[PDB]
């Protein structure tokens, strides 16, 4: 662990700089962007949109994003490579499986899924030689028998390579506790694991208990809010009705409890989003015109106004991501 | 119609010759061959295996196969074009959706799905310019709401372009009756539609009722049998416990009832199969070493011996597929 894999190759830990640890270029399904690009206008329109976004996030000080799109969330690593190069923003690619595995994945054993995740980390994604730098996994409430396999394989791959694991939860159902249990059953260090979408709970003790055990806490979808458009059931279900300030104040909460070193922050933004209702992207872009810049432009200043030391903010946005992304084998 | 689109471009209707109407190069999931080729040993190994198979089918008289792998069933049209060229066998590619749509498909409207099926027929698949020549759709028992949409969009695409529709059914549940109802509600001619996997029933009345209405009946997985592998639960679920001769006798039954013109026959073979249990391809290749050559090598002489005139067998394996695949507007 002296280098972090990106879609442009390895970078040093110090090169990562300000890092958004949970983002997407395009939330889709495997093959979908290749087969139906006109769903996004065109592939070129999507790329141009991504580059404009990335460039504006760069302007606000973002140096690196971690794209946590998996194979079943439509990751297209050649698009990532293209936009990373055009925008001059580092991108870290993911392996793992998210909430929508097709049959060829759902039927696999824990050993098979381990070999798959290892392939994407060690050999590269598809025929690109681009090596994943993180492993994304998911539950939404109690794990399905298959999701149990996925978590165990992610733990096995992370123990082998040192690359971290980062998760989708339903935070209101306290999924992080079962995920931690399964990870620890495989002997994974909690410091290898980010329990994501954790900004969906106001249950502060659920977060503090996990932080105290060494887990990273992903407060990773701060701009998500349907305040102002709650008639729209599909957007409400996705964005929630808690304000961005509510989400952002959990960062301050965990800091105030002594866990500044356990916090990772992100927007969870995307430039295309086919795996939900049509035009959800337009709805989201009107909610948060800053897009991926929302963290530096809105959240960091808000927290400083609320008294959080800038140096603590820097620890959260630079140190924590570098420590987490640094591949780290156990002793 | 006057041309059938293949992965190598348009062929004339006479050029199709002996045609297997329900096959696969690789039964997989979208993206899966590109992301994890080592599941199949390697892409190279899978291709070499397909080329061997296709060349042996060609030796047995197969000129054309229809690969009914959709987007969600792992179709990789570049693979198809590669092996079609190497083996010198015409391959017709499909659009549609089979039984494993991802979210980005499952969440779509009938109008959106229609546009996607049209793109693959009219434009091309992915960035390849390879145009589909058939639309595959699926139910397994009563149609879900999304499946209604898929069938309606298939019907609308077939009415627009004239390319046929072919189906997966659970024949035990008489899915062809609902499929037909849907297709007819959209105004699609039955002669544009093959009701597939129909060799899984023994209810000849179900089949004749469809054949009478002008549907094509796809007796399409003749070599599928788990007789002798009763201990293998997953193989038995897939293959069934009826023999190949029992499946093949349905062809003669339909001929005898007067419906030779409604019958399409195939193996439903594959060279890779990731969308099922591990090693299912090894189990199936043991059951049926002939692979896609099974129809010409075993089935056609079996029927000949039972009394079926060779002219009849030729009408089934050449004339019917030509009439089906010929794009035909209302
Ligand atoms: C692709 As998501 C809304 O689970 O971060
Ligand atoms: C890929 As199949 C077994 O539905 O023909
Ligand atoms: Zn750099
Ligand atoms: Zn998520
Ligand atoms: Zn949420
Ligand atoms: Zn996400
Ligand atoms: Zn300070
Ligand atoms: Zn030819
Ligand atoms: Zn089928
Ligand atoms: Zn069957
Ligand atoms: Zn009956
Ligand atoms: Zn099939
Ligand atoms: Zn004769």
Query: What residue owns the CA closest to ligand 2's atom 2?
Result: B268
Looking at A49, A90, A136, A152, which residue is catalytic?
A136
For residue A276, report the phi and psi dihedrals to the nearest 5 degrees: -145, -165
Helical axes B43-59 vs B77-87, angle rounded to 10°: 50
- Between CA A47 and CA A37 the distance in angstroms is 11
Cα A327 to averaged position of ligand 7 atoms, centre (Å): 30
Angle at Cα A161 formed by Cα A160 and Cα A163, nearest 5°? 125
Residue B193 pairs with which residues in a beta bridge? B165
Q: Any binding-site annotation on B136?
A: yes
Q: How far is CA B45 from the centre of its chain?
A: 23
**Known active-site residue A256:** no
User: Among B257, B143, B155, B248, which Cα is nearest to B206's?
Assistant: B257
Q: Are residues A243 and A227 in contact, defined by beta-carbon separation less than 8 angstroms?
A: yes
CB–CB of B126 and A276 under 8 A? no
User: Among B8, B4, B9, B33, which Cα is nearest to B19's?
Assistant: B4
Query: What residue owns the CA closest to ligand 2's atom 5?
Result: B268
- Between CA A191 and CA A217 the distance in angstroms is 10
- Between CA A153 and CA A70 the distance in angstroms is 14
Neighbouring residues of B228: CB distance < 8 A, sequence distance ≥ 6: none
End-to-end Cα distance, chain B: 11
Helix, coil or strand: residue B22: strand
Q: Are residues B182 and B148 in contact, defined by beta-carbon separation less than 8 angstroms?
A: yes
- Between CA A190 and CA B65 the distance in angstroms is 53
Q: Any binding-site annotation on A90?
A: no
**Contact residues on chain A for B71, CB-CB shorter than 8 A:** 31, 35
Number of C-beta neighbours around residue A61 at 10 A:
14
Query: What resolution in angstroms does the PDB record give?
Result: 1.6
Q: What is the DSSP letter of B200?
A: G
Ligand 2 nearest-atom number relative to CA B238: 3
Neighbouring residues of B37: CB distance < 8 A, sequence distance ≥ 6: B43, B46
Q: Are residues A106 and A71 in contact, defined by beta-carbon separation less than 8 angstroms?
A: no
- Between CA A156 and CA A149 the distance in angstroms is 10
Q: Are residues A163 and A157 in contact, defined by beta-carbon separation less than 8 angstroms?
A: yes
- Between CA B109 and CA A106 the distance in angstroms is 26
Neighbouring residues of B218: CB distance < 8 A, sequence distance ≥ 6: B21, B22, B166, B167, B194, B195, B196, B197, B198, B199, B264, B265, B266
Residues of B carrying an active site annotation: 22, 24, 136, 168, 197, 200, 221, 268
- Between CA A101 and CA A99 the distance in angstroms is 6
Among A20, A27, A32, A223, name the best residue to mutate to test ligand 1's pocket (greatest count of ligand atoms within 8 A of Cβ): A27
**Contact residues on chain A for B29, CB-CB shorter than 8 A:** 30, 102-105
Q: What is the DSSP letter of B268?
A: -
- Between CA B110 and CA B121 the distance in angstroms is 17
Q: What is the dihedral of CA B17, B21, B26, B30, to 10 degrees?
A: 120
Q: Are residues B180 and B193 in contact, defined by beta-carbon separation less than 8 angstroms?
A: yes
Ligand 1 nearest-atom number relative to CA A196: 5
Number of C-beta neighbours around residue A310 at 10 A:
11
Give A121 to chain B, closest Cα distance, Å: 12
- Between CA A310 and CA A301 the distance in angstroms is 9
Cα A49 to averaged position of ligand 3 atoms, centre (Å): 21
Question: What does the block give as tokens for B301?
Answer: 């002489």
Q: Which chain A residue shows the shortest CA-CA distance from B124? A: A35
- Between CA A270 and CA A292 the distance in angstroms is 8
Question: What does the block give as tokens for B33?
Answer: 């061959």
Burial group, residue A95, by CB count within 10 angstroms (0-12, 13-18, 19+): buried
CB–CB of B32 and A30 under 8 A? yes
Question: What does the block give as tokens for A77?
Answer: 């690593």
Q: Are strands B193-195 and A90-96 parallel, antiparallel or unpaired?
A: unpaired
- Between CA B112 and CA A39 the distance in angstroms is 9
Q: What is the DSSP letter of B56?
A: H
Number of C-beta neighbours around residue B210 at 10 A:
23
- Between CA A300 and CA B212 the distance in angstroms is 72
Residue with tokens 């002296």: A2
**Contact residues on chain B for A276, CB-CB shorter than 8 A:** 103, 107
The method recorded for this entry reads X-ray
* DSSP assignments along B127-190, one per residue: TS-PPPSEEEEE-SSSPPHHHHHHHHHHHHHHHHH---EEEE--GGGTHHHHHHHHHHHTT--G
Chain breaks in chain B (C to N over 2.5 A) after: none
Alpha-carbon separation of residue B266 from A209, A274, B315, B321 (angstroms): 60, 36, 14, 11
CB–CB of B31 and A31 under 8 A? yes
User: Among B123, B26, B13, B20, which Cα is nearest to B74's?
Assistant: B26
Q: Which chain A residue shows the shortest CA-CA distance from B40? A: A104
Helix, coil or strand: residue B204: helix
Question: What does the block give as tokens for B178?
Answer: 């609902």
- Between CA B37 and CA B46 the distance in angstroms is 9
For domain A1-331, give the CATH superfamily. Answer: Metal-dependent hydrolases (3.20.20.140)
CB–CB of A107 and B277 under 8 A? yes
Residue A9 pairs with which residues in a beta bridge? A6
Among the partner residues B31, B39, B127, nearest to A30 by beta-carbon distance: B31
**Contact residues on chain A for B107, CB-CB shorter than 8 A:** 274-278
Helix, coil or strand: residue B276: coil
- Between CA B223 and CA B299 the distance in angstroms is 9
Give B275 to chain A, closest Cα distance, Å: 4
Neighbouring residues of A301: CB distance < 8 A, sequence distance ≥ 6: none
Q: Are residues A116 and A42 in contact, defined by beta-carbon separation less than 8 angstroms?
A: no
Give B51 to chain A, closest Cα distance, Å: 22
- Between CA B215 and CA B169 the distance in angstroms is 14
- Between CA A6 and CA A3 the distance in angstroms is 9
Cα B300 to averaged position of ligand 13 atoms, centre (Å): 13
Burial group, residue A40, by CB count within 10 angstroms (0-12, 13-18, 19+): buried
Q: What is the DSSP letter of B253?
A: H
Helix, coil or strand: residue B32: helix
Q: Are residues A26 and A272 in contact, defined by beta-carbon separation less than 8 angstroms?
A: yes
- Between CA A8 and CA A81 the distance in angstroms is 6
- Between CA A320 and CA A220 the distance in angstroms is 14
Fold of B1-330: TIM Barrel (3.20.20)
Question: How would you write chain A as a 3-class SS string?
Answer: CCEEEECCEEEEHHHHCCEEEEECCEECCCCHHHHCHHHHCCHHHHHHHHHHHHHHHHHCCCCEEEECCCCCCCCCHHHHHHHHHHHCCEEEEEEECCCCCCHHHHCCCHHHHHHHHHHHHHHCCCCCCCCCCEEEEECCCCCCHHHHHHHHHHHHHHHHHCCCEEEECCHHHCHHHHHHHHHHHCCCCHHHEEECCHHHCCCHHHHHHHHHCCCEEEECCCCCCCCCCCCCHHHHHHHCCCCHHHHHHHHHHHHHCCCHHHEEECCCCCCEECCCCCCHHHHHHHHCCCHHHHHHHHHHHHHHHCCCCHHHHHHHHHHHHHHHHCCCCCC
Question: What does the block give as tokens for A330?
Answer: 């156990």
- Between CA A203 and CA A210 the distance in angstroms is 12
Residue B243 pairs with which residues in a beta bridge? none
- Between CA A256 and CA A307 the distance in angstroms is 11
Residue with tokens 């460039």: A55
Cα A22 to averaged position of ligand 6 atoms, centre (Å): 6
Q: Any binding-site annotation on A24?
A: yes
**Contact residues on chain A for B120, CB-CB shorter than 8 A:** 35
Among B21, B27, B32, B223, name the best residue to mutate to test ligand 2's pocket (greatest count of ligand atoms within 8 A of Cβ): B27
Cα A200 to averaged position of ligand 5 atoms, centre (Å): 5
Q: Which residues line ligand 2 (CB under 6 A)?
A: B 24, 27, 73, 168, 268
Long-range pairs of B11-16 with CB within 8 A, sequence gap ≥ 24: B11/B64, B11/B90, B13/B322, B13/B325, B13/B326, B14/B322, B15/B63, B15/B90, B16/B63, B16/B64, B16/B90, B16/B318, B16/B321, B16/B322, B16/B325
Q: What is the dihedral of CA B97, B102, B108, B112, to 10 degrees?
A: -50
For residue B139, report the phi and psi dihedrals to the nearest 5 degrees: -130, 160
Q: Are residues B210 and B218 in contact, defined by beta-carbon separation less than 8 angstroms?
A: no
Question: What does the block give as tokens for B293?
Answer: 């050559």
Residue B64 pairs with which residues in a beta bridge? B19, B90
């Amino acid at each position: 662990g002296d280098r972090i894999n990106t879609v442009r190759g390895p970078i040093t830990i110090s090169e990562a700089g300000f890092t958004l640890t949970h983002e997407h270029i395009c939330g889709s399904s495997a093959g979908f962007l290749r087969a139906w690009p006109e769903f996004f206008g065109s592939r070129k329109a999507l790329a141009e949109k991504a580059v404009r976004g990335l460039r504006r996030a760069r302007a606000a000080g973002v140096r690196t994003i971690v794209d946590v799109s998996t194979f079943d969330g439509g990751r297209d690593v050649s698009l990532l490579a293209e936009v990373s190069r055009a925008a001059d923003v580092h991108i870290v690619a993911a392996t793992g499986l998210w909430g929508d595995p097709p049959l060829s994945m759902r039927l696999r054993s824990v050993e098979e899924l381990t070999q798959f995740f290892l392939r994407e980390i060690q050999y590269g994604i598809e025929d690109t030689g681009i090596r994943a730098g993180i492993i994304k996994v998911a539950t939404t409430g109690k794990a399905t028998p298959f999701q149990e396999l996925v978590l165990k394989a992610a733990a096995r791959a992370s123990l082998a390579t040192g690359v971290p694991v980062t998760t989708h939860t339903a935070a209101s159902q306290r999924d992080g506790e079962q995920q931690a249990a399964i990870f620890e059953s495989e002997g994974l260090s909690p410091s290898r694991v980010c329990i994501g979408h954790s900004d969906d709970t106001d249950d502060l003790s659920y977060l503090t208990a996990l932080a105290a055990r060494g887990y990273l806490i992903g407060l990773d979808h701060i701009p998500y809010s349907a305040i102002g458009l709650e008639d729209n059931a599909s957007a409400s279900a996705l964005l929630g009705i808690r304000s961005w300030q509510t989400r952002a104040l959990l960062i301050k909460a965990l800091i105030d409890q002594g866990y500044m070193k356990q916090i990772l922050v992100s927007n969870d933004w995307l430039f295309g989003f086919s795996s939900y209702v049509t035009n959800i992207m337009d709805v989201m872009d009107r909610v948060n015109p800053d897009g991926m810049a929302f963290i530096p432009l809105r959240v960091i200043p808000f927290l400083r106004e609320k008294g959080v030391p800038q140096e603590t903010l820097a620890g959260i946005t630079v140190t924590n991501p570098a420590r987490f992304l640094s591949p780290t084998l156990r002793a």
